[PDB]
Amino acid sequence: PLGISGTFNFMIVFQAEHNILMHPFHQLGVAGVFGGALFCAMHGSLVTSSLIRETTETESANYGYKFGQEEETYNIVAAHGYFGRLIFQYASFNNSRSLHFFLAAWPVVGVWFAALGISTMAFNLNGFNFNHSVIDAKGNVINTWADIINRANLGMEVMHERNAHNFPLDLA
Amino acid sequence: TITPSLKGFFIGLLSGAVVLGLTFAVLIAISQIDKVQR
Amino acid sequence: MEPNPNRQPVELNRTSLYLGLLLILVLALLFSSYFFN
Amino acid sequence: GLPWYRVHTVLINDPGRLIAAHLMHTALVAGWAGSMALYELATFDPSDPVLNPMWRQGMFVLPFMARLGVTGSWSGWSITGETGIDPGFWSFEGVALAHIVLSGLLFLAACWHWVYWDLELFRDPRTGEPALDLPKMFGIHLFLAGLLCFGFGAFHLTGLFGPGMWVSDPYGLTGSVQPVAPEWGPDGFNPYNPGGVVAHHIAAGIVGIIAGLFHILVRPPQRLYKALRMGNIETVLSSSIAAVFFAAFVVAGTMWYGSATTPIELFGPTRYQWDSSYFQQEINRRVQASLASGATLEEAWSAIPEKLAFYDYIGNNPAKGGLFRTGPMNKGDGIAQAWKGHAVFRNKEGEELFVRRMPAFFESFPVILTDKNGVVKADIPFRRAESKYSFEQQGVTVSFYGGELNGQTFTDPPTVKSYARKAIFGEIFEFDTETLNSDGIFRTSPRGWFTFAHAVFALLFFFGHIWHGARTLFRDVFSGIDPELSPEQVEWGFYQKVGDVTTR
Amino acid sequence: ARRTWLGDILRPLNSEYGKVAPGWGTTPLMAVFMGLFLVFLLIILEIYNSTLILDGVNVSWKA
Amino acid sequence: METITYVFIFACIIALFFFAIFFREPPRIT
Amino acid sequence: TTGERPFSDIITSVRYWVIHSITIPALFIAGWLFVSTGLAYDVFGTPRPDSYYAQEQRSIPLVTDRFEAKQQVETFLEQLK
Amino acid sequence: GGRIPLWIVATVAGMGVIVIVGLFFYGAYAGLGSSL
Amino acid sequence: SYPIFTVRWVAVHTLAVPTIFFLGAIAAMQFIQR
Amino acid sequence: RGWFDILDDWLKRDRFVFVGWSGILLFPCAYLALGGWLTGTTFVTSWYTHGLASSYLEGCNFLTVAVSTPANSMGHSLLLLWGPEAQGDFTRWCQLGGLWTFIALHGAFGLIGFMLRQFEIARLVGVRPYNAIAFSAPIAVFVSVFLIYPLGQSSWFFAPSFGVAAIFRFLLFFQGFHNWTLNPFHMMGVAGVLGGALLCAIHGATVENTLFQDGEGASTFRAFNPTQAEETYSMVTANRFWSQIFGIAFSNKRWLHFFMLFVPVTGLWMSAIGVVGLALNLRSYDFISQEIRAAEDPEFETFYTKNLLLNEGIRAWMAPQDQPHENFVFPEEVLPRGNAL
Amino acid sequence: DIDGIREPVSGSLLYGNNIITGAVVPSSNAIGLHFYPIWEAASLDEWLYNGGPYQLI
Ligand code: CLA
Ligand code: CLA
Ligand code: CLA
Ligand code: CLA
Ligand code: CLA
Ligand SMILES: CCCCCCCCCCCCCCCC(=O)OC[C@H](COP(=O)(O)OC[C@@H](O)CO)OC(=O)CCCCCCCCCCCCCCC
Ligand SMILES: CC1=C(/C=C/C(C)=C/C=C/C(C)=C/C=C/C=C(C)/C=C/C=C(C)/C=C/C2=C(C)CCCC2(C)C)C(C)(C)CCC1
Ligand SMILES: CC1=C(/C=C/C(C)=C/C=C/C(C)=C/C=C/C=C(C)/C=C/C=C(C)/C=C/C2=C(C)CCCC2(C)C)C(C)(C)CCC1
Ligand SMILES: CCCCCCCS[C@@H]1O[C@H](CO)[C@@H](O)[C@H](O)[C@H]1O
Ligand SMILES: CCCCCCCS[C@@H]1O[C@H](CO)[C@@H](O)[C@H](O)[C@H]1O
Ligand SMILES: CCCCCCCS[C@@H]1O[C@H](CO)[C@@H](O)[C@H](O)[C@H]1O
Ligand SMILES: [Ca+2]
Numbered sequence A: 001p002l003g004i005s006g007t008f009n010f011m012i013v014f015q016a017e018h019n020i021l022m023h024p025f026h027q028l029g030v031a032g033v034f035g036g037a038l039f040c041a042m043h044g045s046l047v048t049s050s051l052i053r054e055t056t057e058t059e060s061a062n063y064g065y066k067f068g069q070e071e072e073t074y075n076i077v078a079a080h081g082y083f084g085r086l087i088f089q090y091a092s093f094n095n096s097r098s099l100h101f102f103l104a105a106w107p108v109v110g111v112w113f114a115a116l117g118i119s120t121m122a123f124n125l126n127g128f129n130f131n132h133s134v135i136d137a138k139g140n141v142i143n144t145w146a147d148i149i150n151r152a153n154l155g156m157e158v159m160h161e162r163n164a165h166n167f168p169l170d171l172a
Numbered sequence B: 001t002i003t004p005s006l007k008g009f010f011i012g013l014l015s016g017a018v019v020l021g022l023t024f025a026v027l028i029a030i031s032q033i034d035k036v037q038r
Numbered sequence C: 001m002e003p004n005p006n007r008q009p010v011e012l013n014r015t016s017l018y019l020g021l022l023l024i025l026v027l028a029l030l031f032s033s034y035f036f037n
Numbered sequence D: 001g002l003p004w005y006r007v008h009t010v011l012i013n014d015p016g017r018l019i020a021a022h023l024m025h026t027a028l029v030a031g032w033a034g035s036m037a038l039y040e041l042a043t044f045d046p047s048d049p050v051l052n053p054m055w056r057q058g059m060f061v062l063p064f065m066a067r068l069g070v071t072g073s074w075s076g077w078s079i080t081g082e083t084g085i086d087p088g089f090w091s092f093e094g095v096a097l098a099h100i101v102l103s104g105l106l107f108l109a110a111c112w113h114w115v116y117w118d119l120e121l122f123r124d125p126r127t128g129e130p131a132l133d134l135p136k137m138f139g140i141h142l143f144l145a146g147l148l149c150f151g152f153g154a155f156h157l158t159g160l161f162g163p164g165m166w167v168s169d170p171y172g173l174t175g176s177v178q179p180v181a182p183e184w185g186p187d188g189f190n191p192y193n194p195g196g197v198v199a200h201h202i203a204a205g206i207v208g209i210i211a212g213l214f215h216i217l218v219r220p221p222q223r224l225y226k227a228l229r230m231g232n233i234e235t236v237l238s239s240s241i242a243a244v245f246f247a248a249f250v251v252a253g254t255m256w257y258g259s260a261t262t263p264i265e266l267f268g269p270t271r272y273q274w275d276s277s278y279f280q281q282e283i284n285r286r287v288q289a290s291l292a293s294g295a296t297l298e299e300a301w302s303a304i305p306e307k308l309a310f311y312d313y314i315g316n317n318p319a320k321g322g323l324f325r326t327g328p329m330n331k332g333d334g335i336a337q338a339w340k341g342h343a344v345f346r347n348k349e350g351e352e353l354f355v356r357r358m359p360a361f362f363e364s365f366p367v368i369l370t371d372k373n374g375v376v377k378a379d380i381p382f383r384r385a386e387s388k389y390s391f392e393q394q395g396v397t398v399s400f401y402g403g404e405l406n407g408q409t410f411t412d413p414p415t416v417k418s419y420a421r422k423a424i425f426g427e428i429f430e431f432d433t434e435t436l437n438s439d440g441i442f443r444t445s446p447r448g449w450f451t452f453a454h455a456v457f458a459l460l461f462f463f464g465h466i467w468h469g470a471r472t473l474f475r476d477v478f479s480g481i482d483p484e485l486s487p488e489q490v491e492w493g494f495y496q497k498v499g500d501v502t503t504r
Numbered sequence E: 001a002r003r004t005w006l007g008d009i010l011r012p013l014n015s016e017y018g019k020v021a022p023g024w025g026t027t028p029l030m031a032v033f034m035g036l037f038l039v040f041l042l043i044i045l046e047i048y049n050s051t052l053i054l055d056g057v058n059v060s061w062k063a
Numbered sequence F: 001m002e003t004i005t006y007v008f009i010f011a012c013i014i015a016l017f018f019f020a021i022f023f024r025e026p027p028r029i030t
Numbered sequence G: 001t002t003g004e005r006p007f008s009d010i011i012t013s014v015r016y017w018v019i020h021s022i023t024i025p026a027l028f029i030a031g032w033l034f035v036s037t038g039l040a041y042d043v044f045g046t047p048r049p050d051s052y053y054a055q056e057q058r059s060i061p062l063v064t065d066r067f068e069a070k071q072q073v074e075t076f077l078e079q080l081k
Numbered sequence H: 001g002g003r004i005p006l007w008i009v010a011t012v013a014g015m016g017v018i019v020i021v022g023l024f025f026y027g028a029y030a031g032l033g034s035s036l
Numbered sequence I: 001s002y003p004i005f006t007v008r009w010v011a012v013h014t015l016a017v018p019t020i021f022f023l024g025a026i027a028a029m030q031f032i033q034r
Numbered sequence J: 001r002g003w004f005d006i007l008d009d010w011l012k013r014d015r016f017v018f019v020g021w022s023g024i025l026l027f028p029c030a031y032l033a034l035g036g037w038l039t040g041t042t043f044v045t046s047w048y049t050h051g052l053a054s055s056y057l058e059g060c061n062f063l064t065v066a067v068s069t070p071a072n073s074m075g076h077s078l079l080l081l082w083g084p085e086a087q088g089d090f091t092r093w094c095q096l097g098g099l100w101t102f103i104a105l106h107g108a109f110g111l112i113g114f115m116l117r118q119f120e121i122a123r124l125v126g127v128r129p130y131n132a133i134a135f136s137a138p139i140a141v142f143v144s145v146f147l148i149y150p151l152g153q154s155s156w157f158f159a160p161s162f163g164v165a166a167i168f169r170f171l172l173f174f175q176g177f178h179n180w181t182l183n184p185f186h187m188m189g190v191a192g193v194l195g196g197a198l199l200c201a202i203h204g205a206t207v208e209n210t211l212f213q214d215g216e217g218a219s220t221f222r223a224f225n226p227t228q229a230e231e232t233y234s235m236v237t238a239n240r241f242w243s244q245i246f247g248i249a250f251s252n253k254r255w256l257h258f259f260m261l262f263v264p265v266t267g268l269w270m271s272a273i274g275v276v277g278l279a280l281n282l283r284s285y286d287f288i289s290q291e292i293r294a295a296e297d298p299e300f301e302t303f304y305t306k307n308l309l310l311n312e313g314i315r316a317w318m319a320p321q322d323q324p325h326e327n328f329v330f331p332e333e334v335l336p337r338g339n340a341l
Numbered sequence K: 001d002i003d004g005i006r007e008p009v010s011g012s013l014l015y016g017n018n019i020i021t022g023a024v025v026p027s028s029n030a031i032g033l034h035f036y037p038i039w040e041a042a043s044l045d046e047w048l049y050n051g052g053p054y055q056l057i
């Protein structure tokens, strides 16, 4: 639906019908947007941390940069010097083109997988189903967290569009 | 009385003091043996 | 009488006005449903 | 010029205008307290401490006045339900007026300090530069805090020269303001023991006096002076914000779990008393004692105070509200009028059935009745076509003991179901929903609202601390890093010790 | 700067800006008070939490 | 009143877009 | 540039592989036997497949008493009999 | 020093990871966790 | 000439050593039948 | 130059993995949090606390393993190995959920160590400490969700369990019980996470697509030098491009990069505030006007009323297995269901 | 009528929604994947009932 609550409706019903959370393409999606946010904040904070002094304390440091200037406005070498020590040297980018390409690629690829998760659950190839996967020596079901998910999903399934189903299986 | 959980509290306290004590002893020792050149 | 040497002028540039009005208006559009309840 | 988010930095090197800004803030806060108390007095109904106490009415400052001994109005009532009391000057009204006058005086002092900012007192006698000697100011203020803390504990809380504090029995039935003697043994550390609050203030007070004298008399070590930047006022902002968030998480936790300083008659009961059926267990104890001593069932239940039954009702649990469900709890379920009595459900065979209570997590909950062993005996079905346990099939009845309905029995399924629906909330009450146009939906009490505001502000103050700590320790680079920063200083292994040129 | 009667009286209390004791001074004594305060907080936390349970110390409304 | 309020805030945001685009401070190489 | 030996030196040297062609398989085997001997179950208190329930029981052995929780677990274990 | 070529170490290490991961997938279909 | 036992060496083995032990344990588990 | 300064020297040596004074807090706490997770997910059950299998040893896979919260009857016990519950018994401590508070508490101290490390390194290298400042958002999330939330609830049982499927359960629980999608603090979180992912993608792509030709190679990464003075891409061309495509564009690189910190950091901090309300069940669950209308008018329906029906199904269907200490028994006939399903 | 069962769902502000509850509601399950432009409806009133704005949008 084109609307805020209707969006959540579409999500909850999608969960009931495809177990999207247990689908690896939605998992890559989450890694893409959580990681896009993480890298956005990381890049922001590293560039901000290494701005070259050009202003006084009574003015915004933003005035230190002029639109179209030729010289870079932060020191990449100090930024890398920082981040390579935070983790270890070889986990930090010293090539701005490489870094920026990574910033483009990580969210874009994850989001392509999110889109493909929706577009392939469209044909009912659904999330992993470990319902009753763990069984004891007698054959008793030993629930896991997958089975608890399953019970939440059942709640959604049995309640959604409460007057629309006449037959026992929801096949589309 | 020293209840059993007060004895447990002393035990946690001693264990923590030991871990931190031994950790600082070791790092001080190593720092002394392995000085930077100036 | 003697003026205070700590005085500074204050600035809000146009872009900041626009950014700020957008923040405020969007926050209001978001929270208004909850204020009406 | 300065960006909008820096306008107050003009005060950093102006001690007199900083004191003016502080005075103004203090005037605003004290004016708030005064106005808030007035608004509460203009809306508060003192006519029923039992079923309409302050915490059902959205009172937020009234319980703070009460906690420290302010319990009466000039108009003659008291929050414990007395009439014809003379509170003297220090009624809720005199406390509000004192705050408003204080606000006015502080506003005037601010004006003076703002105009007359350039006082010789604020200049370093060696350099002529504005300067505050913060380490010695700390000892002076700490000494003052210690004396005040001591005197509050030794005189006000003991009743030695003051009123004492609010105390009550374990079920919040007979609270009042009493003098409290310090507890000097290990039970002084029990959050529920009022004597420990007294001993705290006496003891921490003495410690603050002593530490204050130390901080007046002994200079900081060079090493700490430099490490904490003790010449920079912003260091004090950073650490004081840290102390304040610590204190705020603490008062949120003690509000939520309950202590001798968050009594249930002033703030409402806790969610945990519902979770563990704290009041239901006591009620059942009393009823069993009554029966053992030979009372009839009607008499045993009739002896339960309405005040006790009311704590055993989920409408008073602070974990049942909504962030945007605004106002007093009375706005939701209504103004409580009377206990209906204790409902006892029975099936056609005459066995006692027990309605399963709603846990706080649940906005809606089914109606399921079990026998004393937890076996299901009756419910309100959703699907009817294969129902086995309907009240119509099981001939469920309800009889009331105590309260308005004492001695009555209802056998008609709509009425029996109606009461079963209420029994999921615990004890059943009659409400006036008309006076406030109450909407039927649960709201939290001042215990919940206080905990929320303080946990949130505490968390936000953690950011304030990180931010000002950062500004303090990195003051040298806050406009940017050295434009002539050595690539050597950041290239690996150039220096043996990161960023130390003497290790090249 | 303006002198006043009260500023003259208080002048000594704000005249040692920057004044420090040599080296580490009382840092080690401070450290001991900090460690003792840490243990104090731990005790009161563990009592409230019921992780430390003491005779005669019933952490409950029924204290 | 509520609908008026929602539509009013929305219409302000649309106006704001117009000014932010066509009446922006122009970026200057300098 | 921080003083330690380059990894790619280390992991292409014959001596690295002489050491590690022992220690790696040794660790792996020791992990294997930690499970195959059943020791893992005993150290951690994890049920074996025949140890979740007594033959006829169908209620989970949920801990319900904070301070006697140790004894309750011990009691649940005894009842596997 | 540099006696074993890095491309060989990589290929063998990589094959080792594929084998162990493959075993874990085999195990999803057999014994505990297999639903059977 | 390089040292062998360095902080890096310790960091590496604190992780590598349990990882190999655990991978052998998890490999054995794949043969467990109910 | 006493032992303190000699230790300081050694802690601050420029080595492959920097240590610092912060390392003394960070390394042990992080190692134990991560090792405790790997140990529990590999070997440890949740049979006694949840009635679940949760380790590779019992047959779970990487998606379903977890270290699960302690039983609800533990309340908010620290659950210390030497505490009154486990009484020094490592086996019983595993069975009672001690690894949960172990991981959450070393994890919390380890995050403090990490942020101190960001401050300590920034200081040594001489940069401004904005990376540490930004890290306050992960800390506000960890603390609100793993500590404050369960502390406002009945016990640690209701904190998230450390596990992939377990965390998914925690999302679905918040929908069915807190209607957490409806909460404007969560909605601001979403906007700052998705907004931050948007900024990450669009800025990386813009720089990569406004590059100056600085080499002859068709693969353009080598045509950059860390020490070069000049911008590697054209701000002026980028600015024109977005001004003409979208209407506005950045013109100030310092502002651009500050905004990239601000947006996802601010989002996370907002979501944390909402979770602090949820600790108290102080939800945005309902619109009262909606309910009053729908109660009186059985033809009035919105997507808001539809999602509450879904929530009521989630709660009734999941509670008996998800909340085993309540001993819920809900007869078939009381379960909310629509037609057929 | 999103689900084609003659149970119309209100999406608009003037019909009782706020910004959070409001939506343009998907077209009718009776339509399915049939193309439903304005000129396939007998009237605007029919077009609205069946969720024609959703497809146009
Ligand atoms: C510690 C703060 C505090 C607390 C806990 C309370 C508690 C209470 N008050 Mg008091 N009050 C306060 C301060 C407080 N008050 C102040 C400062 C004033 C002057 C405004 C008042 C004036 C007042 C009146 C006039 C009344 C109360 C009443 C009440 C009760 C109902 C509260 C309610 O419905 O809240 C509802 C709370 C909310 C809806 C939450 C608001 C959340 C905001 C909007 C979030 C904003 C988000 C932000 C914009 C995001 C920025 C994002 C950006 C950074 C990117 C409750 C006991 C009522 C009562 O019953 O009186 C007897 C009553 O009538 N209060
Ligand atoms: C005692 C607490 C305290 C004090 C005295 C200060 C003082 C200062 N702060 Mg710090 N700060 C604090 C806590 C505090 N802060 C907390 C809790 C946070 C996190 C929320 C911050 C986050 C912070 C940042 C990110 C910055 C400061 C900055 C500043 C400086 C300039 C402030 C200014 O001009 O704003 C002017 C503010 C306005 C013109 C309007 C602000 C409107 C707010 C956002 C909404 C309305 C607030 C409402 C009136 C408050 C009610 C009170 C509340 C407690 C309920 C000043 C030294 C700035 C700085 O360092 O400059 C160099 C700066 O950039 N602060
Ligand atoms: C993410 C957490 C965090 C971070 C990164 C910082 C960072 C900062 N702190 Mg702040 N601080 C914090 C949390 C934090 N603090 C908390 C929770 C408090 C308590 C209220 C403080 C109180 C404080 C003060 C009073 C001051 C600082 C200052 C500083 C600055 C210098 C470094 C320092 O002093 O660290 C301090 C060290 C730590 C936070 C690590 C403490 C490690 C503890 C001791 C481990 C305890 C283990 C425990 C006992 C185990 C039992 C647990 C129990 C649950 C069972 C820097 C901006 C100083 C500054 O502003 O100078 C300008 C300053 O004056 N801090
Ligand atoms: C910096 C490293 C660090 C930190 C901050 C912590 C912090 C913590 N650990 Mg972890 N731990 C560590 C390293 C660390 N550990 C290491 C290296 C190991 C391997 C040995 C462990 C193994 C471990 C286990 C097995 C457990 C913990 C637990 C805990 C928690 C409670 C600790 C406590 O109560 O101590 C109390 C002690 C102190 C705070 C030390 C006080 C030092 C003072 C200042 C000096 C006073 C001592 C005095 C001289 C002694 C006199 C006693 C006398 C009266 C008898 C807390 C989160 C428990 C937990 O997680 O449970 C859920 C738990 O079961 N830790
Ligand atoms: C559009 C879809 C969408 C988006 C973008 C979000 C976005 C967000 N959601 Mg929401 N959610 C959604 C839909 C969505 N949600 C729906 C439909 C529901 C159903 C109601 C939820 C239910 C939900 C819950 C229940 C919660 C969120 C939370 C969040 C926030 C998580 C922030 C984060 O990264 O925490 C990740 C964790 C951290 C940042 C903590 C620190 C992590 C440290 C740094 C990890 C270090 C790891 C270490 C190095 C080693 C790892 C080893 C390895 C083996 C794993 C974020 C704002 C959370 C939130 O609000 O928290 C305040 C939260 O509790 N959501
Ligand atoms: C490097 C140029 C490419 C730029 C792309 C950057 C992408 C980032 C990818 C990161 C992951 C892969 C690493 C780089 C991969 C890379 O560039 O390869 C090369 C790199 C260095 O190889 P050498 O053979 O030169 O190693 C020796 C050096 O010390 C030089 O003497 O090898 C590694 O670092 C592998 C990781 C082992 C490290 C294990 C140590 C574990 C210690 C724990 C760390 C905790 C610290 C955090 C604080 C909490
Ligand atoms: C001058 C003078 C005087 C008078 C005075 C007066 C009359 C005063 C008053 C004062 C006052 C009367 C004050 C008040 C104040 C208030 C305040 C200060 C408030 C604030 C608020 C706030 C801050 C809020 C916030 C918020 C909101 C709004 C919403 C929700 C959220 C929150 C809570 C955040 C006299 C005669 C004495 C004499 C001397 C002179
Ligand atoms: C807890 C505790 C402790 C500690 C312990 C520890 C510290 C441990 C550690 C442990 C460890 C340290 C372990 C490890 C393990 C590991 C593993 C198990 C891994 C695996 C991996 C894998 C499986 C991989 C996969 C993959 C990925 C990830 C991606 C790429 C692709 C692939 C698929 C290959 C102590 C004693 C103190 C005390 C008590 C408690
Ligand atoms: C602002 C005008 C002040 C009006 C003063 C009325 C004096 S009233 C006076 O107040 C005392 C409080 O110390 C009471 O203890 C005492 O019983 C009472 O008579
Ligand atoms: C069908 C009504 C006859 C049974 C009495 C209903 C249960 S009790 C009833 O509950 C109402 C809230 O629903 C209160 O407002 C009212 O005061 C109270 O009388
Ligand atoms: C864990 C560090 C905190 C305690 C710091 C107090 C240092 S104490 C200090 O130690 C010096 C050597 O460093 C000695 O030369 C000196 O005599 C002594 O006073
Ligand atoms: Ca009405």
Ligand SMILES: [Ca+2]
Pocket (backbone or CB within 6 Å): A137, I033, I034
């Ligand atoms: Ca078998």
Ligand SMILES: [Cl-]
Pocket (backbone or CB within 6 Å): A009, A013, A159, A160, A161, A162, J306
């Ligand atoms: Cl639906």
Ligand SMILES: [Cl-]
Pocket (backbone or CB within 6 Å): A164, A165, A166, A167
């Ligand atoms: Cl059908």
Ligand SMILES: [Fe+2]
Pocket (backbone or CB within 6 Å): A043, A047, J203, J207
């Ligand atoms: Fe960039």
Ligand SMILES: [Mg+2]
Pocket (backbone or CB within 6 Å): H026, H027, H028, H029, H030, H031, H032, H033, H034, I029, I030, I031, J059
């Ligand atoms: Mg298997």
